[PDB]
Amino acid sequence: TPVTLAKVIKVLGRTGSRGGVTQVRVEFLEDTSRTIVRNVKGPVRENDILVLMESEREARRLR
Amino acid sequence: GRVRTKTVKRASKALIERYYPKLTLDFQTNKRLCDEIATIQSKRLRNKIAGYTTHLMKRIQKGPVRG
Amino acid sequence: VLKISTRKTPNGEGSKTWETYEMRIHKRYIDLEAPVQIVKRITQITIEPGVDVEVVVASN
Amino acid sequence: GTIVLYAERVQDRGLSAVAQAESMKFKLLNGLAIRRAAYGVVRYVMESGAKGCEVVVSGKLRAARAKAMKFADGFLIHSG
Amino acid sequence: FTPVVLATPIPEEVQQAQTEIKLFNKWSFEEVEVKDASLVDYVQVRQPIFVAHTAGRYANKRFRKAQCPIIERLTNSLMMNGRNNGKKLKAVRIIKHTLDIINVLTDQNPIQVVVDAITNTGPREDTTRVGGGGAARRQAVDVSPLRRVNQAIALLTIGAREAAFRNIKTIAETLAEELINAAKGSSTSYAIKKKDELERVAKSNR
Amino acid sequence: GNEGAIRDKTAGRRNNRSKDVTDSATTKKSNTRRATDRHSRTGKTDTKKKVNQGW
Amino acid sequence: AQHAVILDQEKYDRILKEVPTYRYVSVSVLVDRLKIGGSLARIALRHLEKEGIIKPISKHSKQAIYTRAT
Amino acid sequence: AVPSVQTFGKKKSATAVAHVKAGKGLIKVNGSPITLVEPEILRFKVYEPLLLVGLDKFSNIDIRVRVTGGGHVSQVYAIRQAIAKGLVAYHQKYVDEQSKNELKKAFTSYDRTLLIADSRRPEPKKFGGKGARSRFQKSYR
Amino acid sequence: PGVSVRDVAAQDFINAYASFLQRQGKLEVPGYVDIVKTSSGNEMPPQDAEGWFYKRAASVARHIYMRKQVGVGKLNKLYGGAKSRGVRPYKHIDASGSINRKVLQALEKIGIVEISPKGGRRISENGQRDLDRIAAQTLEEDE
Amino acid sequence: SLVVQEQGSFQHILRLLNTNVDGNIKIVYALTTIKGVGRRYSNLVCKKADVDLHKRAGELTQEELERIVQIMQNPTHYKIPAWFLNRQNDITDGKDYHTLANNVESKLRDDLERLKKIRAHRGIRHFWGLRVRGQHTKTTGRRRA
RNA sequence: UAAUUGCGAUAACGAACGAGACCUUAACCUACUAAAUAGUGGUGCUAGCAUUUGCUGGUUAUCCACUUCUUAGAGGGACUAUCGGUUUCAAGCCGAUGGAAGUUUGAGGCAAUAACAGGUCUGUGAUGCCCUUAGACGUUCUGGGCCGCACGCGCGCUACACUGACGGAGCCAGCGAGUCUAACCUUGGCCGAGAGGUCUUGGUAAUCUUGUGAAACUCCGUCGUGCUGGGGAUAGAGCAUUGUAAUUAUUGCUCUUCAACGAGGAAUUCCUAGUAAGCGCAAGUCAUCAGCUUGCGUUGAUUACGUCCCUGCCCUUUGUACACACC
Ligand SMILES: [Mg+2]
Ligand SMILES: [Mg+2]
Ligand SMILES: [Mg+2]
Ligand SMILES: [Mg+2]
Ligand SMILES: [Mg+2]
Ligand SMILES: [Mg+2]
Ligand SMILES: [Mg+2]
Ligand SMILES: [Mg+2]
Ligand SMILES: [Mg+2]
Ligand SMILES: [Mg+2]
Ligand SMILES: [Mg+2]
Ligand SMILES: [Mg+2]
Ligand SMILES: [Mg+2]
Ligand SMILES: [Mg+2]
Ligand SMILES: [Mg+2]
Ligand SMILES: [Mg+2]
Ligand SMILES: [Mg+2]
Ligand SMILES: [Mg+2]
Ligand SMILES: [Mg+2]
Ligand SMILES: [Mg+2]
Ligand SMILES: [Mg+2]
């Protein structure tokens, strides 16, 4: 099973009608240079570390 | 929220307007200044004021302020 | 502090708003060692609408 | 002898709520026009050096359905 | 350890372990580490404590909740289901007890097995109901470290509580048991099943 | 009297249990009017002369 | 009504030979050896302490903890 | 007399007064030795300052505490406060500063509000519910 | 060093003192003990049966040693607890004024407590004596 | 306390007072399955019979058991107050009894009937299968009979 | 921004009501003025254990001194301060340090203009008109009734146990209240299993009840998963209290009798920190009766620090033949 480590950078905001969801851009630590935006379920600030279970499929707006 | 009502902001204006020599970047003395230099009816309203008239003061130093 | 806690309504209708009146009682005492004269001089005058003065004597 | 009564006129009735209420009562019982009654009561209190005054008349006059009126002049404050 | 005694005497082992190391009930904070990346920061351990009771203001600000010593975080979460609401003294004792049991079994800093089980039972990603139009499908997300710690605590505790319910075995054992099994997950713990079944469904929608 | 009360068949729990329950026992509030609150029913009316003398 | 509440001789023996390899020995443990009920198990704990196999690592009511002697 | 200071500790309601005079290392709470002080699960909450700042230190002093009010927890958190405050007051007048600041540095660096009392307090309930925030159940119909 | 009972934890003191009075024989036990209940806020009698009257008296002693004067009223309340009013909310309830008042009469006959001025019962001068003894005994149990 | 042994000396289930009693239950509580005897009564009767309460029902020597029953039906000779007794002042011979076992069934009946047979309101209320001690019967108790 | 709270934009400029201010309460003062109705240290008089000085108690004035703790007067304190991020470098917002305190400091009191056929003539010797007024719808006296029970709805209490029940043991609050022409709050001593009784007693009260020794909770035991010792409905028999009166059982005690309930369908309530929840207390009512309420302290969390999806409201825009205003 591949694992993937990404450092959160810059809180972009809340999506999801309810609002519990939070869009953030992250940076990989296993070779940086590339960043990707993710949707989160819990509370998040800058410099957190997210286990991307699959390192390549970013999302956008939630309903 | 901590938005100062007009009465505080109004009064700070009036005081910086005509006591810029005297007055300081220091609240503590701006406080005491307010006593001699203006009647106010409550200790709370005075610091509320003097704190803000210090704020306005502290950033006139770094350029003008409209009003 | 004498509290009285009551419904505002004369009747029953409405959300049940409760309201507590209060009356504060302040009591002092000053102990004096003085002759018969000053005592009465000090009791009769120094009076005031609102303050209840009580003078007791006694060893006990 | 343990009880003693002393009457004593008041300094300017024109700043005594109770004074002016009872005046209207009386005014209105000699049947002055509603507004004439109250409007003078305002304009005397004012004269007696008040910083604001205000009168309400609620209830029923001549018509069947109940009404109410504000009569006010000068400055009031209402809170705290 | 340079002995010292005054008027009202202070107990041997008490002088002995305290003044030296600042360790737990009588367990070691040092060594103990968060074996998964992240979770560091969002799991305490150091500063070290004696027992897990504290008048801690971990509430009045958003994230400071993180700073609470994770052993005592665990304990707080032990004291619920209305009948046990409050009752920290009751709880704390279970942990002291629990940690002893965890210890007896498979050696190891018991305070570290706690660390393993927590790290090991929080969902790395999850689902959330999305508008989509009435028939609201399931959109996947990656979950916060904080959220991931919290769920681990709550999951761990619950599974034991329900194990403890209606049976001879005590809170402390089932809690110890739940943990020990959750150290490196073993499909028999209420939490791992729930983690795994949660990531089953999370991966079931992307 | 009391003699009758116990001797009286047609009474006591068994008997009520063995009876169906009225439907009036599960009604609503009944309301009956409230939708006419602002429409005065006196059938009078005041009038601008009599109001103007009053006020 | 489902067996636990006594001392059946062949049981006592089992409570002597079966207890080694018990890495953990508590109240719950003893009932779980398809045998004694809590009461005449709590008595066992103090009596295996008479001499051997169990060291008292933890104390009190509700919770007991013993391990294999060394 | 002898060199001494008096200090206090307050948590919730509980007020723990302490007398810290010069003596031979005595520490008794309410009349009994500190090695008792049950609840006891929390015992180390009150052993805590001693260990924090070196088991010695108390050799030139005595300590008594008197806790009234509060309850079976708020008194423990209160007495420890008065104990460690007590020790710092003593150096403040009798020993020296750098030795005072030494102590206050470890009491702070650890802290469970050991020198400074906790501000928290009950909030008054208000009519309509059994709690300060809680409102009674309602029904619409 | 020298020793006061205050220098011993409750369950270490009283259980040593309770054992003392039982090991001794001078006491006065009521007789209704074994059929009585300790309080109307209770459900079953004491399980110590042969005993427990020693244990209260031992506790009663130590309490009255720890203070100026106290009487039945206070001890009734001290030993009172919750009474399950069945389906209704609990309230505190006072315990039995007999078991206590008779313990007071007992401990006094054996000279560990005396009637007191200002009211109540004061710790005896021979109570001090004999209590600080066994205190110094179970401190010696950890010698 | 003790680790005991016993030969085949203890039997499971044993029958006294026309009812059955489980063997491996502590003898105080074991006794309660008998109608009319509750925990307080059981407890005292045993203390009086000089039995070791630590024991289960089955252990008890047949002598000890026989003794026990004997006190249960003559509580007042064998020194047990009276305020311990379910039927003080027998409203006819006015003695003080402790109705037991099968008898408590019959003496409930006898009482219920004395009321009914005298037409007293309580009786009537019993015959109507209602609540008697004056409880609102609007809301509570509806499944029931 | 909690706020028509401000910044800013600007045919507007500059103000007042309401918001804020204000007031009350809870937090900080070893700074000020004091206290035998609050308390500390010393000293006598004195008990106990040690003795080497010690340790732990007793003593409404045997004396001296103080005000830390308690009390309440006068002041002081905080102004989101300093610093740093972010922002139209604007009002602001966020983070760190410090601080008794930095969510409007926390919680309240006050509260403009206007609306409703809201509720109250059953609070009033407030009141119009109507009805009735001696075989009364006046009033009082005797007895019953508001409690009645196939059943539907709402608020509640207690539980379905082992984070427990039971038994012994530890043993800690705060807000309160109490008797004059009177029988209120009750200590202590006896008697009683208990409820209670009896004899005295302190208090018009920071003085006495009362340290309200409260309950959860803490400890050592017993029971061991069995409707069990969880649970305590229903019911019999006896004692006692309030009251002129207790039957349709006022309440309290005792033995016995030992139900439903094995965590609850669709639905739905409340809540963000000393808060939720658990726990008891005082006060109102009150002769007697709290499963209710108003407050109070004790133990003390999990989870947000978001959004407009549901629901409710407010705002512009927009339509009107409505203005008694969609009833
Ligand atoms: Mg204003
Ligand atoms: Mg205001
Ligand atoms: Mg409960
Ligand atoms: Mg108690
Ligand atoms: Mg008790
Ligand atoms: Mg029975
Ligand atoms: Mg009823
Ligand atoms: Mg002071
Ligand atoms: Mg800080
Ligand atoms: Mg209407
Ligand atoms: Mg009215
Ligand atoms: Mg009614
Ligand atoms: Mg309601
Ligand atoms: Mg208990
Ligand atoms: Mg008798
Ligand atoms: Mg008198
Ligand atoms: Mg049962
Ligand atoms: Mg029960
Ligand atoms: Mg009451
Ligand atoms: Mg009511
Ligand atoms: Mg238009």
Nearest to H46 by CA among H12, H13, H87: H87
Q: How many residues does chain E have?
A: 206
Neighbours of D8 (CB within 10 A): 5
Name the token pair of G43.
């008595």
Q: Is the dihedral of CA G59, G60, G63, G66 positive or negative?
A: positive
Nearest to H83 by CA among H35, H37, H18: H18
Q: Tell me if E146 and A20 make a contact (CB, 8 A cut-off).
A: no
Residue ranges making up the domain that contains I91: 1-143
Neighbours of E18 (CB within 10 A): 22
Nearest to B60 by CA among B13, B3, B8, B10: B13
Q: Show which positions of strand K are touched by protein (CB under 7 A).
A: 1-3, 5-9, 15-23, 26-28, 30, 37, 40-42, 47-51, 54-59, 68-70, 72-73, 76-83, 90-96, 100-120, 122-124, 147-177, 186-196, 206, 210-211, 213-226, 228-229, 231-239, 247-250, 252-258, 268-281, 290-309, 324-325, 327
Name the token pair of H6.
């008096």
Chain J residues whose beta carbon lies within 8 Å of the beta carbon of residue I49 = 47, 53
Work out whether strand C2-7 and strand C18-23 pair parallel, antiparallel, or are unpaired: antiparallel
Q: Tell me if F55 and D60 make a contact (CB, 8 A cut-off).
A: no
Query: Is the minimum CB–CB distance between H116 and chain E shorter than 8 Å?
Result: no
Q: Which of D34, D58, D60, D65 to mutate to test the interface with F (most CBs of F within 10 A)?
A: D65
Work out whether strand A5-15 and strand A21-28 pair parallel, antiparallel, or are unpaired: antiparallel
Q: Tell me if J47 and I44 make a contact (CB, 8 A cut-off).
A: no
List, in sequence order, every residue forming a beta bridge with F27; answer none if it has no partner.
Answer: none
Residue nearest to nucleotide K162 (CA to C1'): E168
Listed in sequence order, the DSSP H helices in B20-42 are 27-37
Contact residues for E183 (Cβ-Cβ < 8 A; gap 6+): E106, E113, E116, E117, E120
Q: Tell me if D63 and F44 make a contact (CB, 8 A cut-off).
A: no
CA atoms lying within 13 Å on the CB side of residue I89: 2
Number of compact structural domains in chain I: 1
Q: What is the helix (H) or strand (E) element at residue D67, kind and residue range?
A: strand D67-73
Tell me the nearest-neighbour CA distance from E169 into chain G, angstroms.
5
Tell me the nearest-neighbour CA distance from G4 into chain E, angstroms.
13
User: How far apart are the two ends of chain B, measured CA to CA in Å?
Assistant: 23
**What spacing in Å lies between the alpha carbon of I81 and ligand 4's midpoint?**
6
> Which nt sits closest to E82, CA to C1'?
K277
Distances in Å between the Cα of G42 and the Cα atoms of E94, E109, G48, G70 are: 19, 29, 10, 23
Please tell me the distance from the alpha carbon of residue E137 to that of residue E135, in angstroms, as a whole number. 6
Q: Closest-lying ligand to the alpha carbon of J131?
A: 7
Provide the angle, in degrees to the nearest 10, between the axes of the packed helices B6-19 and B43-58. 60
List, in sequence order, every residue forming a beta bridge with H64; answer none if it has no partner.
Answer: H19, H28
> Which nt sits closest to B51, CA to C1'?
K79
Q: At G49, which amino acid appears? A: E
Q: How many residues does chain A have?
A: 63
| Structural domains in chain B plus CATH codes | 6-61 (1.10.60.20)
Annotated resolution, angstroms: 3.0
Name the token pair of I65.
């040693």
Tell me the nearest-neighbour CA distance from J85 into chain F, angstroms.
32
Nearest to A7 by CA among A60, A58, A52, A56: A52
Q: How far is the CA of E37 from the C1' of K155 (A)?
A: 53
A25 phi, psi to nearest 5 deg: -90, 140
Per-position b or e across J96-128, b if 16+ CB within 10 A of its CB: bbbbbbebbeebeeeeeeebbeebeeebbbbbb
